[PDB]
Amino acid sequence: ATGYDAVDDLLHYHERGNGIQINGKDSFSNEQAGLFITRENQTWNGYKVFGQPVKLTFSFPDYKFSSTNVAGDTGLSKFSAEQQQQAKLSLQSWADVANITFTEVAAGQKANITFGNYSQDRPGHYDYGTQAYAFLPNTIWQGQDLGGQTWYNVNQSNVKHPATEDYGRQTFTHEIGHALGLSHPGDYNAGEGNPTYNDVTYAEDTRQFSLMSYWSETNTGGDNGGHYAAAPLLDDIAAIQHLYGANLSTRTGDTVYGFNSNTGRDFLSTTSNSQKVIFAAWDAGGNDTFDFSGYTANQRINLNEKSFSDVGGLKGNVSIAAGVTIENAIGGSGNDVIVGNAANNVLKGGAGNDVLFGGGGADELWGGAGKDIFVFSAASDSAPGASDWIRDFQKGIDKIDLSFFNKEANSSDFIHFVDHFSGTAGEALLSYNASSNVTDLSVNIGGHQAPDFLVKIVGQVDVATDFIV
Ligand SMILES: [Ca+2]
Ligand SMILES: [Ca+2]
Ligand SMILES: [Ca+2]
Ligand SMILES: [Ca+2]
Ligand SMILES: [Ca+2]
Ligand SMILES: [Ca+2]
Ligand SMILES: [Ca+2]
Ligand SMILES: [Zn+2]
């Protein structure tokens, strides 16, 4: 396959919405999913009151063991230090993406959101079957609002030890989601008490898209390698930003995600090949980098909004929220596909045989070691006055892929190299400056005397060996 083939594949990964069908189910857009996840229309600001900020209190009540909660469970207890630590990280991950402020109050004081353990379904009888539950805002029961109560079965090791068992951390984030107004992404009525993914309302009801889902990411072709996302995923972000607005203050500086991270978030960071990230990135400003340099797997990194990447040997485990511009990407030692966006991007392949695609804007492309391919598919990819730079081209090793153009023209003779321009569309001209070590690649795509495409290349280029046309 050409570099362009790989780029095209990654660009059309997890297409959604616009009425298409997936797995025999309706596909929802990110926006549609956010609305459906919030279909109960309940918020802490009121019924059908959307887009407004909120300040909420939370606490860890000192629940009495022989007490019985509103759901009929007993053997209650206070959250441990470990549970409190992880719950606070889950709270923060919601506050990162929407205009929610969380403030802890004392155990005995009235709080909007509470956390408690249960262990028995009736006195003296331990429950090994259930996991957790919570009540949405404005859930009125016997005249009282249950909204904000969250409850967890501490017999489950993941609930007891969420710092080392990542399903426990996901469960905290999930139940807080309910406490904020999110539902499961379907009611699964057709399942009649024994539901499966076959009972979803829309195809993207999986853990690839929402941690409010219980269905495996594999149902949509994801693969999280046995791990569970700690923090709100792509459609969760749409849902909670619908409810309380997008947080425009978050990570507005120059932010590095992955290796060498300055996020100060465990779920956005890694320090080793074995530590696998799973996240949907929310970022409100600055010049940002997806640094996946420390992974050995073949990776696919897409810097477009709402798009999915294959990172660290997982599939569809990294994504970028709607409205977010991520500028730079760094691949690992594997054979990577790296696709930029309309902004100026710095793309670095690292070792391995990589495919780089800058797209629009003035991009800076580093193949690194290996046999790399730099792909172009529009004049606007590298317009005179905003040219791409390929900063480390090695003749006889790297390649420039212009194959899109002759495929589109259905002609082997559209793109062709000449020693001088004539005005004929398709002409390509190489000009080598041995003094500066820079080669110019100019192409007349649109059919004018002045070329409308100019790539600047550090290094010699051998026309006989270095192109895919
Ligand atoms: Ca940033
Ligand atoms: Ca940015
Ligand atoms: Ca690489
Ligand atoms: Ca770009
Ligand atoms: Ca490389
Ligand atoms: Ca290279
Ligand atoms: Ca470009
Ligand atoms: Zn739930």
CSV table of C-alpha atoms and ligand atoms in Angstrom, one decimal:
chain,number,residue,atom,x,y,z
A,1,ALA,CA,0.0,0.0,0.0
A,2,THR,CA,1.1,3.6,-0.7
A,3,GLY,CA,1.5,6.2,2.0
A,4,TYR,CA,-1.6,7.8,0.6
A,5,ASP,CA,-3.6,4.6,1.1
A,6,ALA,CA,-2.6,4.5,4.7
A,7,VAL,CA,-3.6,8.2,5.2
A,8,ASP,CA,-6.9,7.7,3.5
A,9,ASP,CA,-7.6,4.7,5.7
A,10,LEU,CA,-6.8,6.6,8.9
A,11,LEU,CA,-8.9,9.6,7.8
A,12,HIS,CA,-12.0,7.4,7.4
A,13,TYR,CA,-11.6,5.4,10.6
A,14,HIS,CA,-14.8,5.3,12.7
A,15,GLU,CA,-17.0,7.3,10.4
A,16,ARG,CA,-20.2,8.1,12.1
A,17,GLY,CA,-23.5,10.0,11.9
A,18,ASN,CA,-25.3,11.3,8.8
A,19,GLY,CA,-27.7,8.4,9.0
A,20,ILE,CA,-25.3,5.6,8.2
A,21,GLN,CA,-25.6,2.1,9.7
A,22,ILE,CA,-23.0,0.2,11.7
A,23,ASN,CA,-23.4,-3.3,13.1
A,24,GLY,CA,-27.0,-3.2,11.9
A,25,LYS,CA,-27.6,-0.2,14.1
A,26,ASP,CA,-28.1,3.6,13.7
A,27,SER,CA,-24.8,5.5,13.9
A,28,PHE,CA,-25.0,8.7,16.0
A,29,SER,CA,-22.7,11.7,15.6
A,30,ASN,CA,-20.7,12.9,18.7
A,31,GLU,CA,-23.4,15.6,19.2
A,32,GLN,CA,-26.2,13.1,18.8
A,33,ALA,CA,-24.6,10.7,21.3
A,34,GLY,CA,-24.1,13.5,23.8
A,35,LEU,CA,-27.8,14.4,23.6
A,36,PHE,CA,-28.9,10.8,23.9
A,37,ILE,CA,-26.7,10.1,26.9
A,38,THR,CA,-28.4,13.1,28.5
A,39,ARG,CA,-31.9,12.2,27.4
A,40,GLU,CA,-33.3,12.4,30.9
A,41,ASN,CA,-32.7,16.2,30.6
A,42,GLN,CA,-31.8,16.4,34.3
A,43,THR,CA,-29.1,18.8,35.6
A,44,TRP,CA,-28.1,20.4,38.9
A,45,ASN,CA,-29.3,23.7,37.4
A,46,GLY,CA,-32.8,22.4,36.7
A,47,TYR,CA,-34.8,20.2,34.3
A,48,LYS,CA,-33.8,21.1,30.7
A,49,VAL,CA,-31.5,23.8,31.9
A,50,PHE,CA,-28.4,23.4,29.7
A,51,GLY,CA,-25.0,25.0,29.2
A,52,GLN,CA,-24.8,26.7,32.6
A,53,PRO,CA,-21.9,26.4,35.0
A,54,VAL,CA,-22.4,24.7,38.4
A,55,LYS,CA,-20.7,24.6,41.8
A,56,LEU,CA,-21.2,21.4,43.7
A,57,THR,CA,-20.2,20.1,47.1
A,58,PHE,CA,-19.1,16.5,47.7
A,59,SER,CA,-18.3,14.4,50.8
A,60,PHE,CA,-17.5,11.0,52.1
A,61,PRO,CA,-20.1,10.3,54.9
A,62,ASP,CA,-19.2,8.1,57.8
A,63,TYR,CA,-21.9,5.5,57.1
A,64,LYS,CA,-22.9,3.1,59.8
A,65,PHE,CA,-22.6,-0.6,59.0
A,66,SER,CA,-26.0,-1.8,60.1
A,67,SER,CA,-27.7,1.2,58.5
A,68,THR,CA,-29.7,0.6,55.3
A,69,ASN,CA,-29.5,3.0,52.3
A,70,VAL,CA,-32.4,4.1,50.1
A,71,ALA,CA,-31.8,1.2,47.7
A,72,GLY,CA,-32.1,-1.4,50.5
A,73,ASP,CA,-28.4,-2.3,50.7
A,74,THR,CA,-26.6,-2.5,54.1
A,75,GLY,CA,-23.2,-3.3,55.6
A,76,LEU,CA,-22.3,0.3,54.8
A,77,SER,CA,-19.0,2.0,55.3
A,78,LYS,CA,-17.0,5.2,54.7
A,79,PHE,CA,-14.7,5.5,51.7
A,80,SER,CA,-11.1,4.5,52.5
A,81,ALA,CA,-8.2,6.9,52.0
A,82,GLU,CA,-7.4,5.1,48.7
A,83,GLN,CA,-11.0,5.3,47.5
A,84,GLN,CA,-11.1,9.0,48.4
A,85,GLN,CA,-7.9,9.7,46.5
A,86,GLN,CA,-9.2,8.1,43.4
A,87,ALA,CA,-12.7,9.6,43.7
A,88,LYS,CA,-11.1,13.1,43.8
A,89,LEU,CA,-9.2,12.3,40.6
A,90,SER,CA,-12.4,11.2,38.9
A,91,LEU,CA,-14.2,14.4,40.0
A,92,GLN,CA,-11.3,16.4,38.6
A,93,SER,CA,-11.5,14.7,35.3
A,94,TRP,CA,-15.2,15.9,34.9
A,95,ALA,CA,-14.3,19.4,36.1
A,96,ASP,CA,-11.5,19.5,33.5
A,97,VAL,CA,-13.9,19.2,30.6
A,98,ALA,CA,-17.1,21.1,31.8
A,99,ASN,CA,-17.8,24.2,33.9
A,100,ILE,CA,-18.2,22.3,37.1
A,101,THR,CA,-16.6,23.2,40.4
A,102,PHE,CA,-16.3,20.5,43.1
A,103,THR,CA,-15.7,21.5,46.8
A,104,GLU,CA,-15.3,18.9,49.6
A,105,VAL,CA,-17.4,19.4,52.7
A,106,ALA,CA,-17.1,17.7,56.1
A,107,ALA,CA,-18.4,14.1,56.5
A,108,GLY,CA,-21.4,15.2,58.6
A,109,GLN,CA,-22.4,18.1,56.4
A,110,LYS,CA,-25.0,18.2,53.6
A,111,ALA,CA,-23.3,17.5,50.3
A,112,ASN,CA,-24.6,17.4,46.7
A,113,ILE,CA,-22.5,14.4,45.7
A,114,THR,CA,-21.7,11.6,48.2
A,115,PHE,CA,-19.7,8.4,48.0
A,116,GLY,CA,-20.5,5.3,50.1
A,117,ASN,CA,-19.6,1.6,50.3
A,118,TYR,CA,-22.1,-1.1,50.8
A,119,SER,CA,-21.4,-4.8,51.2
A,120,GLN,CA,-24.7,-6.6,52.0
A,121,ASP,CA,-28.0,-6.9,50.3
A,122,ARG,CA,-29.7,-7.7,53.6
A,123,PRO,CA,-28.4,-7.8,57.2
A,124,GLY,CA,-25.6,-10.4,57.7
A,125,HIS,CA,-25.5,-11.4,54.0
A,126,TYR,CA,-22.6,-10.3,51.8
A,127,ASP,CA,-23.3,-9.3,48.2
A,128,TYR,CA,-20.7,-10.6,45.6
A,129,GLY,CA,-22.9,-9.9,42.6
A,130,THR,CA,-23.4,-6.2,42.1
A,131,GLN,CA,-21.0,-3.3,41.3
A,132,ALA,CA,-22.3,0.2,41.8
A,133,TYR,CA,-25.2,2.6,41.3
A,134,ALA,CA,-26.1,6.3,41.5
A,135,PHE,CA,-29.0,8.7,41.3
A,136,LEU,CA,-29.4,11.4,38.7
A,137,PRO,CA,-30.1,15.1,39.7
A,138,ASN,CA,-33.7,15.8,40.8
A,139,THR,CA,-34.6,12.2,41.6
A,140,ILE,CA,-37.4,12.8,44.1
A,141,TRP,CA,-38.2,10.0,46.4
A,142,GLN,CA,-40.5,10.4,49.5
A,143,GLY,CA,-40.2,14.1,49.0
A,144,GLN,CA,-36.4,14.1,49.1
A,145,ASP,CA,-33.8,14.6,46.3
A,146,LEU,CA,-31.6,11.4,46.0
A,147,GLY,CA,-29.6,13.1,43.2
A,148,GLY,CA,-25.9,12.9,43.8
A,149,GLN,CA,-25.8,9.7,45.9
A,150,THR,CA,-23.3,7.2,44.6
A,151,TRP,CA,-22.9,3.7,46.0
A,152,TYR,CA,-20.3,1.0,45.4
A,153,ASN,CA,-20.0,-2.7,46.4
A,154,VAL,CA,-16.7,-2.8,48.3
A,155,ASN,CA,-16.7,-6.6,48.2
A,156,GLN,CA,-15.5,-6.1,44.6
A,157,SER,CA,-11.7,-5.8,44.7
A,158,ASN,CA,-11.8,-3.1,42.0
A,159,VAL,CA,-14.0,-0.9,44.2
A,160,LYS,CA,-11.8,-1.5,47.2
A,161,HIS,CA,-8.6,-0.9,45.3
A,162,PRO,CA,-9.3,1.6,42.5
A,163,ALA,CA,-5.7,2.9,42.5
A,164,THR,CA,-4.4,-0.4,41.2
A,165,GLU,CA,-7.6,-1.9,39.6
A,166,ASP,CA,-8.6,0.4,36.8
A,167,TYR,CA,-12.2,-0.8,36.5
A,168,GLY,CA,-12.7,0.7,40.0
A,169,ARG,CA,-11.5,4.1,38.9
A,170,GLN,CA,-13.7,3.9,35.7
A,171,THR,CA,-16.6,2.9,38.0
A,172,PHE,CA,-16.1,6.0,40.1
A,173,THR,CA,-16.0,8.2,37.0
A,174,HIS,CA,-19.1,6.5,35.6
A,175,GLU,CA,-21.2,6.8,38.8
A,176,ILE,CA,-20.2,10.5,39.1
A,177,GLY,CA,-21.4,10.8,35.5
A,178,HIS,CA,-24.9,9.6,36.7
A,179,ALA,CA,-24.7,12.0,39.7
A,180,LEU,CA,-24.1,14.8,37.2
A,181,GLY,CA,-27.0,13.9,34.8
A,182,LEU,CA,-25.7,11.3,32.4
A,183,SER,CA,-27.5,8.0,31.7
A,184,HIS,CA,-26.3,4.8,30.2
A,185,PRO,CA,-26.3,5.4,26.4
A,186,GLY,CA,-29.3,3.0,26.0
A,187,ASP,CA,-32.2,1.5,28.0
A,188,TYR,CA,-31.7,-1.9,26.3
A,189,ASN,CA,-35.5,-2.6,26.6
A,190,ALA,CA,-35.3,-5.4,24.0
A,191,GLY,CA,-32.9,-7.3,26.3
A,192,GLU,CA,-35.6,-7.8,28.9
A,193,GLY,CA,-33.3,-7.9,31.9
A,194,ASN,CA,-30.5,-9.8,30.1
A,195,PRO,CA,-29.2,-7.1,27.6
A,196,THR,CA,-26.3,-7.4,25.2
A,197,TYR,CA,-24.7,-4.9,22.8
A,198,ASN,CA,-27.3,-6.2,20.3
A,199,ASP,CA,-29.9,-4.1,22.3
A,200,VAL,CA,-28.2,-0.7,21.9
A,201,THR,CA,-30.0,2.3,20.5
A,202,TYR,CA,-26.9,3.4,18.5
A,203,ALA,CA,-23.8,1.7,17.3
A,204,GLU,CA,-21.3,3.9,19.3
A,205,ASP,CA,-22.7,2.8,22.7
A,206,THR,CA,-19.5,1.1,23.7
A,207,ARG,CA,-16.6,1.8,26.0
A,208,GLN,CA,-14.6,3.1,23.0
A,209,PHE,CA,-16.9,6.2,23.0
A,210,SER,CA,-18.4,6.4,26.5
A,211,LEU,CA,-17.5,5.1,29.9
A,212,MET,CA,-21.2,5.3,30.6
A,213,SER,CA,-21.4,2.2,28.5
A,214,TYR,CA,-21.0,-1.4,29.7
A,215,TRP,CA,-20.3,-2.8,26.3
A,216,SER,CA,-16.8,-3.7,25.2
A,217,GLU,CA,-14.9,-1.4,22.9
A,218,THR,CA,-14.5,-4.5,20.6
A,219,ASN,CA,-18.1,-4.1,19.5
A,220,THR,CA,-17.0,-1.1,17.5
A,221,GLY,CA,-13.6,-2.4,16.6
A,222,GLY,CA,-11.6,-0.8,19.5
A,223,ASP,CA,-9.2,-2.8,21.6
A,224,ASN,CA,-8.1,-1.4,25.0
A,225,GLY,CA,-5.8,-4.3,25.7
A,226,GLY,CA,-7.6,-5.3,28.9
A,227,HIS,CA,-7.6,-1.8,30.3
A,228,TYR,CA,-10.4,0.6,31.2
A,229,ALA,CA,-10.5,4.4,30.6
A,230,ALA,CA,-10.2,6.4,33.8
A,231,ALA,CA,-11.7,9.6,32.4
A,232,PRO,CA,-14.6,10.9,30.3
A,233,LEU,CA,-14.4,9.6,26.7
A,234,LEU,CA,-15.4,11.4,23.5
A,235,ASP,CA,-19.2,11.1,23.7
A,236,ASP,CA,-19.1,11.7,27.5
A,237,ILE,CA,-17.4,15.0,26.9
A,238,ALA,CA,-20.1,16.0,24.4
A,239,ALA,CA,-22.7,14.9,27.0
A,240,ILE,CA,-21.3,16.8,30.0
A,241,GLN,CA,-20.4,19.9,27.9
A,242,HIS,CA,-24.1,20.0,26.8
A,243,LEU,CA,-25.1,20.0,30.4
A,244,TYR,CA,-22.7,22.5,32.0
A,245,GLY,CA,-20.7,24.1,29.1
A,246,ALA,CA,-17.2,23.5,27.9
A,247,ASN,CA,-14.3,24.4,30.2
A,248,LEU,CA,-12.4,27.0,28.3
A,249,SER,CA,-9.7,27.4,31.0
A,250,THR,CA,-8.3,23.9,30.8
A,251,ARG,CA,-4.7,23.3,29.7
A,252,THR,CA,-4.6,26.6,27.8
A,253,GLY,CA,-0.8,26.5,27.8
A,254,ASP,CA,1.5,24.4,25.6
A,255,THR,CA,0.5,20.9,26.7
A,256,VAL,CA,2.3,17.6,26.1
A,257,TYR,CA,0.1,14.4,26.3
A,258,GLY,CA,1.6,10.9,26.7
A,259,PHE,CA,5.3,10.6,27.3
A,260,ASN,CA,7.1,13.6,28.9
A,261,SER,CA,3.7,15.0,29.9
A,262,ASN,CA,3.1,18.2,31.7
A,263,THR,CA,-0.7,17.6,32.2
A,264,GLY,CA,-0.4,16.5,35.8
A,265,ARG,CA,-3.1,13.9,35.0
A,266,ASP,CA,-2.4,10.2,35.4
A,267,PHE,CA,-4.8,9.2,32.6
A,268,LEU,CA,-3.0,11.7,30.1
A,269,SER,CA,0.5,10.5,31.0
A,270,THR,CA,2.8,7.5,30.7
A,271,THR,CA,6.4,6.9,31.7
A,272,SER,CA,7.0,3.5,30.0
A,273,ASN,CA,6.1,1.3,27.1
A,274,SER,CA,4.1,-1.0,29.3
A,275,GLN,CA,1.9,1.9,30.7
A,276,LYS,CA,-0.9,2.2,28.1
A,277,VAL,CA,-2.9,5.5,27.7
A,278,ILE,CA,-6.6,5.6,27.0
A,279,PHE,CA,-8.1,9.1,26.8
A,280,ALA,CA,-10.2,11.6,25.0
A,281,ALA,CA,-8.2,14.9,24.9
A,282,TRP,CA,-9.8,18.2,26.0
A,283,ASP,CA,-7.6,21.2,25.6
A,284,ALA,CA,-8.6,24.8,25.4
A,285,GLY,CA,-5.5,26.5,24.0
A,286,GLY,CA,-1.8,26.6,23.2
A,287,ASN,CA,0.6,24.6,21.1
A,288,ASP,CA,0.1,21.0,22.1
A,289,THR,CA,1.8,17.7,21.4
A,290,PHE,CA,0.8,14.0,21.4
A,291,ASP,CA,4.1,12.5,22.4
A,292,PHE,CA,3.9,8.8,21.9
A,293,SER,CA,7.7,8.4,21.4
A,294,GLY,CA,8.2,5.7,24.1
A,295,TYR,CA,5.9,3.1,22.5
A,296,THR,CA,7.3,0.3,20.3
A,297,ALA,CA,4.0,-0.7,18.7
A,298,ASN,CA,3.0,0.4,15.2
A,299,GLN,CA,0.9,3.5,15.9
A,300,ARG,CA,-1.6,5.6,14.0
A,301,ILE,CA,-2.0,9.1,15.1
A,302,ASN,CA,-4.7,11.4,13.8
A,303,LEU,CA,-4.7,15.1,14.9
A,304,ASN,CA,-8.1,15.9,13.6
A,305,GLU,CA,-11.0,16.8,16.0
A,306,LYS,CA,-13.3,13.9,16.9
A,307,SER,CA,-10.8,11.4,15.4
A,308,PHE,CA,-9.4,8.2,16.8
A,309,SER,CA,-5.8,7.1,17.0
A,310,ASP,CA,-4.2,3.6,17.6
A,311,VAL,CA,-1.7,4.3,20.4
A,312,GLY,CA,0.7,2.1,22.3
A,313,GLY,CA,-0.5,-1.2,20.8
A,314,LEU,CA,-4.1,-0.5,21.5
A,315,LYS,CA,-6.8,0.3,18.9
A,316,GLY,CA,-9.0,3.4,18.9
A,317,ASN,CA,-7.9,4.3,22.4
A,318,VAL,CA,-6.9,7.9,21.9
A,319,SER,CA,-9.2,10.6,20.6
A,320,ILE,CA,-9.5,14.4,20.4
A,321,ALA,CA,-12.7,16.1,21.6
A,322,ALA,CA,-14.8,18.3,19.3
A,323,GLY,CA,-13.5,21.9,19.1
A,324,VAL,CA,-9.9,20.9,20.1
A,325,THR,CA,-6.8,21.7,18.1
A,326,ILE,CA,-3.8,19.5,18.8
A,327,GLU,CA,-0.8,20.7,16.8
A,328,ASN,CA,2.1,18.2,17.0
A,329,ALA,CA,2.6,14.5,17.1
A,330,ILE,CA,5.6,12.2,17.8
A,331,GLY,CA,5.6,8.6,16.8
A,332,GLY,CA,7.5,5.8,18.5
A,333,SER,CA,10.0,3.2,17.2
A,334,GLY,CA,7.3,1.3,15.3
A,335,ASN,CA,6.1,1.9,11.8
A,336,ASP,CA,3.6,4.7,12.2
A,337,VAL,CA,1.0,6.6,10.3
A,338,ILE,CA,0.8,10.2,11.4
A,339,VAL,CA,-1.9,12.6,10.0
A,340,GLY,CA,-2.0,16.3,10.7
A,341,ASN,CA,-4.8,18.8,10.4
A,342,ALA,CA,-5.3,22.3,8.9
A,343,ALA,CA,-3.0,23.9,11.4
A,344,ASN,CA,0.8,24.1,11.3
A,345,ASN,CA,1.9,20.7,12.6
A,346,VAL,CA,5.3,19.4,13.7
A,347,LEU,CA,5.1,15.6,12.9
A,348,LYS,CA,8.0,13.3,13.9
A,349,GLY,CA,8.0,9.7,12.9
A,350,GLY,CA,10.9,8.5,15.0
A,351,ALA,CA,12.5,5.2,14.2
A,352,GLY,CA,10.7,2.8,12.0
A,353,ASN,CA,9.1,3.2,8.6
A,354,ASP,CA,6.6,6.0,9.0
A,355,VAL,CA,4.0,7.7,6.8
A,356,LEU,CA,3.6,11.4,7.5
A,357,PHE,CA,0.8,13.6,6.2
A,358,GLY,CA,0.8,17.3,7.1
A,359,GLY,CA,-2.4,18.4,5.4
A,360,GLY,CA,-3.1,22.1,5.4
A,361,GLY,CA,-1.0,24.8,6.9
A,362,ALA,CA,2.8,25.1,7.0
A,363,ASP,CA,3.9,21.8,8.4
A,364,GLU,CA,7.4,20.6,9.7
A,365,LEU,CA,8.0,17.0,8.9
A,366,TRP,CA,10.7,14.7,10.4
A,367,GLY,CA,10.8,11.2,9.2
A,368,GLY,CA,13.5,10.2,11.6
A,369,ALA,CA,15.4,7.0,11.1
A,370,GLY,CA,13.9,4.4,8.7
A,371,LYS,CA,12.3,4.5,5.3
A,372,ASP,CA,9.7,7.2,5.6
A,373,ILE,CA,7.1,8.5,3.3
A,374,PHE,CA,5.8,12.1,3.1
A,375,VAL,CA,2.4,12.3,1.6
A,376,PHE,CA,0.7,15.1,-0.3
A,377,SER,CA,-2.8,15.3,-1.8
A,378,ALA,CA,-3.6,19.0,-2.4
A,379,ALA,CA,-1.8,22.1,-3.6
A,380,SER,CA,-3.0,23.7,-0.4
A,381,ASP,CA,-1.0,21.2,1.6
A,382,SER,CA,2.1,23.2,0.8
A,383,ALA,CA,1.2,26.5,-0.8
A,384,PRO,CA,4.0,29.0,-1.8
A,385,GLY,CA,4.2,31.4,1.1
A,386,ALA,CA,3.3,28.7,3.6
A,387,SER,CA,5.4,25.8,2.5
A,388,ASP,CA,5.9,22.5,4.3
A,389,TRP,CA,9.5,21.6,5.3
A,390,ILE,CA,10.8,18.1,5.2
A,391,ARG,CA,13.7,18.5,7.6
A,392,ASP,CA,15.6,15.2,7.3
A,393,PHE,CA,15.1,13.7,3.9
A,394,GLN,CA,17.5,10.9,2.8
A,395,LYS,CA,17.7,10.1,-0.9
A,396,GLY,CA,17.4,6.5,-1.8
A,397,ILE,CA,15.8,5.9,1.6
A,398,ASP,CA,12.8,8.2,2.1
A,399,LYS,CA,10.1,8.9,-0.4
A,400,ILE,CA,7.6,11.6,-1.4
A,401,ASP,CA,4.2,10.3,-2.2
A,402,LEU,CA,2.3,12.3,-4.9
A,403,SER,CA,0.3,9.3,-6.0
A,404,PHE,CA,-3.1,10.8,-5.1
A,405,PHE,CA,-2.9,13.1,-8.1
A,406,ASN,CA,-2.6,10.6,-10.9
A,407,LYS,CA,-5.1,8.3,-9.3
A,408,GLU,CA,-7.6,11.2,-9.2
A,409,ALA,CA,-6.8,12.2,-12.7
A,410,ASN,CA,-7.0,8.5,-13.8
A,411,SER,CA,-3.8,9.2,-15.8
A,412,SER,CA,-0.2,8.1,-15.5
A,413,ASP,CA,0.8,11.2,-17.3
A,414,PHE,CA,-0.7,14.0,-15.2
A,415,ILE,CA,2.1,14.4,-12.7
A,416,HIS,CA,5.4,14.2,-14.5
A,417,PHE,CA,8.8,15.8,-14.0
A,418,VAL,CA,10.2,18.5,-16.3
A,419,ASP,CA,13.3,20.6,-16.3
A,420,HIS,CA,11.3,23.8,-16.9
A,421,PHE,CA,7.7,24.9,-16.4
A,422,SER,CA,5.5,25.5,-19.5
A,423,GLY,CA,2.2,26.3,-17.7
A,424,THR,CA,0.9,22.7,-18.3
A,425,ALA,CA,-1.0,21.3,-15.3
A,426,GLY,CA,0.8,18.4,-13.7
A,427,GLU,CA,4.3,19.5,-14.3
A,428,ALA,CA,6.7,18.9,-11.4
A,429,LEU,CA,10.1,20.6,-11.1
A,430,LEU,CA,13.0,19.8,-8.7
A,431,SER,CA,15.6,22.5,-7.9
A,432,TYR,CA,18.7,21.6,-5.9
A,433,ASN,CA,20.8,24.1,-3.9
A,434,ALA,CA,24.0,22.3,-3.0
A,435,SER,CA,25.3,25.3,-1.1
A,436,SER,CA,22.3,25.4,1.3
A,437,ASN,CA,21.5,21.6,1.2
A,438,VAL,CA,17.9,22.4,0.2
A,439,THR,CA,15.8,21.0,-2.6
A,440,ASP,CA,12.7,22.7,-3.8
A,441,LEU,CA,9.8,20.5,-5.2
A,442,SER,CA,7.4,22.7,-7.2
A,443,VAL,CA,4.3,21.4,-8.8
A,444,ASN,CA,1.8,23.1,-11.1
A,445,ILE,CA,-1.5,21.4,-10.0
A,446,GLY,CA,-4.0,24.0,-10.9
A,447,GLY,CA,-2.6,24.9,-14.4
A,448,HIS,CA,-0.9,28.3,-14.0
A,449,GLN,CA,2.6,29.5,-14.9
A,450,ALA,CA,3.5,30.0,-11.3
A,451,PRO,CA,3.4,26.7,-9.4
A,452,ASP,CA,0.7,26.4,-6.6
A,453,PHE,CA,2.6,23.8,-4.6
A,454,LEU,CA,6.1,24.1,-3.2
A,455,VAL,CA,7.7,21.8,-0.6
A,456,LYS,CA,11.1,22.7,0.9
A,457,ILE,CA,13.3,19.8,1.6
A,458,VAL,CA,16.5,19.6,3.7
A,459,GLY,CA,18.7,17.2,1.7
A,460,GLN,CA,19.2,15.8,-1.8
A,461,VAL,CA,16.4,14.1,-3.7
A,462,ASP,CA,16.9,11.6,-6.4
A,463,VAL,CA,14.0,11.8,-8.9
A,464,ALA,CA,14.8,8.3,-10.2
A,465,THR,CA,14.2,6.6,-6.8
A,466,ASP,CA,12.5,8.9,-4.3
A,467,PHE,CA,8.9,9.4,-5.6
A,468,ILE,CA,5.6,7.5,-5.6
A,469,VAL,CA,3.6,8.9,-8.5
B,1,CA,CA,-2.9,23.3,25.7
B,2,CA,CA,-3.8,23.6,20.6
B,3,CA,CA,8.0,5.5,14.1
B,4,CA,CA,-1.1,20.7,8.9
B,5,CA,CA,11.0,7.0,10.6
B,6,CA,CA,13.8,8.4,7.4
B,7,CA,CA,0.9,21.4,5.0
B,8,ZN,ZN,-24.4,3.1,35.4
